[PDB]
């Protein structure tokens, strides 16, 4: 399943840049044969050794392999993949609804019920993943897009799969990555990583989503990491002076240090605040 | 000791950009009153809360405060500091020798004696620091410049003091920062940090310096971190087929997990390979 070794140019019309992380750059584009819009991700292959620039072949494949296994509506989808000598081009689904968070900004008022809507979608998408035994490992507001903003209740789309890694049984994996703010403890304290991680983030997102304040955001990374490791957050009335205990609860069960004690996706879904039993 | 609240442009002639990390950008410049060249570092003040862009006021002061306390010839020196509303401008000494490493390149072979030369300088500068009880915490080839390359044996100059932190007695400090490759274990395993850290790097530099191969550089950060934590490196003959045991030794005593067991700067200096007793 190699990558088509042709020039993308040939089958697509590379348009404007829509974003560019670091060793990869995204530009809107078009399928020549269909006049269909797509998003083209250019992942600069690594130079050689300590090559401060470029992505490892594994990290590459690891991302691709993954994107290929996933096929859920609440998750971004990879149409095609081409490969030249400088970069590796991914033809990904195009996401225009912008960052969920931004949209929510314009929205001036959010009901928990309405909020759980989104959160739930996030869950449904994440669920697909985890089932295929996969960890996005990079869940954050900047990575929670919207298909088309133009609908009372938008379709959330998970993107950015560079930090995604396929979890295996009895094969330990630890590493330090991601935004200081959304990472769980097992990461900060270089410990065994599992799907559990992605859950912590869900909580963090929800906390932010409801209150608009980050549970662990400190003045300095130095500071934050401590909060996360020490698991130090509160439910300040200055923000949670309206929130249901049902909400807060959901939060509480996800922001837990002990892996096995923290809720699992399946668990998180059948939680009253999400799926009202009665 | 606030920052002059004037516009740098008034007393200086901002020239070309010389470098730009992230929330800070450097541009060569000139003192109007003297026609003297300097380097001007622009550190973009933080937006606000979670402000993905901008540096915390502490992080700022913490750097400045520091640079002010240091005044050694093997260490870069801060001439002045101005402060507007967008950035904070530091007037730093200008270093043209480029990166020691690059310089060393041009040279065919390198004698250990000659090598110890540089390494030693590094020590002398680091010594000054440590004595003022300070940890550069960001020692790496990219931060080891040369005053003027134009001398058989150049003047090494330590720069980049953003990660520099002042260590205090009985006041614990842990955090996760720096390049994966040059950080010591106490970092990787979010543990108590001390001047000990900087030493591990000295080792790593030397190893790279002598052999040209990095002791822990792995295919993936994921990989590297394990090497560092597991302390896994060798003295492959493919590179150390010439090196003295004396050298290798120096290395071995710095690349040590246990803080108290690793060599202290003072120790490192009085080491035969460096300061030949006889």
Would you say A18 is a known binding-site residue? yes
Residues 6+ apart with CB under 8 A from A5: A82, A83, A84
Distance CA B204, CA B226 (A): 15
Chain A residues within 8 A of B102 when measuring between CB atoms = none
DSSP 3-state of B56: coil
Q: Test B189 with A189 for CB contact under 8 angstroms.
A: yes
B135 within 8 A of B164, measured Cβ to Cβ: yes
Listing DSSP states for B57-101 in one string gives: HHHHHHHHHHHHH---TTB--EEEEEE-SS-EEEEEPP--S-BHH
For residue A179, which of A203, A196, A167, A163 has the smallest C-alpha distance? A163
A177 touches chain B (CB under 8 A): yes
Confirm if A178 and A218 have CB atoms less than 8 A apart: no
Residues of A in contact with B181 (CB under 8 A): 50
Q: Which residues pair with A90 in a beta bridge?
A: A41, A81
Q: Is residue A236 annotated as a catalytic residue, yes or no? A: no
DSSP single-letter state for residue B186: H
Topology alike, domains B7-97 and B98-278: no
* B221: helix, strand or coil: helix
**What is the architecture of the domain spanning A7-97?**
2-Layer Sandwich (3.30)
List all residues of chain B from 207 to 266 with a beta carbon under 8 Å from chain A. 214, 217, 219-222, 225, 229
Backbone angles phi, psi at B6, to 5 degrees: -95, 175
Separation of alpha carbons B189 and A178, rounded Å? 16
Residues 6+ apart with CB under 8 A from B171: none
A247 marked as binding residue: no
Where do the domains of chain B lie? 7-97, 98-278
40-69 in chain A: CB under 8 A from chain B: 49-50, 56, 58-59
Among A174, A175, A219, beta carbon nearest to B58:
A219
CB B204 within 8 A of CB B215: yes
Q: How far is it, in rounded angstroms, from Cα A19 to Cα A24?
A: 9
> Which of A101, A172, A174, A175 is the best residue to mutate to test the B interface, defined by the most B CB atoms within 10 Å of its own CB?
A175
Rounded Cα–Cα distance for residues B181 and B200 (Å): 11
Q: Which CATH class is domain B98-278?
A: mainly alpha
For residue A218 the two structure tokens come to 């400190």
Nearest one of B195, B199, B175 to B187, comparing CA atoms: B175
| Resolution value, angstrom units | 2.9
Q: Which of B187, B202, B139, B192 is nearest to B168 (CA)?
A: B192
Report the greatest alpha carbon distance in chain A: 59
Contacts of B59 in chain A (CB under 8 A): 220
Q: Is the dihedral of CA B42, B180, B174, A177 positive or negative?
A: positive
Q: Which of A56, A214, A226 sits opposite B219 (nearest CB)?
A: A56
As a whole number of angstroms, the distance between CA A28 and CA A19 comes to 9
A-chain residues near B173 (CB < 8 A):
222
């Amino acid at each position: 399943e190699p990558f088509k070794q042709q020039k993308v140019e040939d089958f697509y019309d590379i348009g404007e840049e829509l974003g560019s992380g670091q060793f990869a750059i995204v530009k809107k584009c078009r399928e020549k044969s269909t006049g269909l819009e797509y998003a083209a991700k250019f992942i600069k292959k690594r130079q050689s050794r300590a090559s401060r620039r470029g992505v490892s072949r594994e990290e590459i494949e690891r991302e691709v392999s993954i994107l290929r296994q996933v096929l859920h509506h609440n998750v971004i989808t990879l149409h095609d993949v081409y490969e030249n000598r400088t970069d590796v081009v991914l033809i990904l689904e195009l996401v225009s609804g912008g960052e969920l968070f931004d949209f929510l900004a314009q929205k001036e008022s959010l009901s928990e019920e309405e909020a759980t809507s989104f959160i739930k979608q996030i869950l449904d998408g994440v669920n697909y993943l985890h089932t295929k035994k996969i960890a996005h490992f990079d869940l954050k507001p900047e990575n929670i897009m919207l298909l088309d903003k133009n609908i009372p209740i938008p379709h959330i789309k998970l993107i950015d799969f560079g930090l995604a890694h396929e979890i295996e049984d009895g094969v330990e994996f630890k590493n330090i990555f991601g935004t200081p703010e959304f990472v769980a403890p097992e990461i900060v304290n270089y410990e065994p990583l599992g799907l559990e991680a992605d859950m912590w983030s869900i909580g963090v997102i929800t906390y932010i989503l409801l209150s608009g304040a980050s549970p662990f955001l400190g003045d300095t990374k130095q500071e934050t990491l401590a909060n996360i490791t020490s698991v130090s957050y509160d439910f300040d009335e200055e923000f949670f002076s309206h929130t249901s205990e049902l909400a807060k609860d959901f939060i509480r069960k996800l922001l837990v240090k002990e892996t096995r004690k923290r809720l699992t996706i399946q668990e998180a879904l059948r939680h009253p605040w999400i799926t009202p039993v009665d």
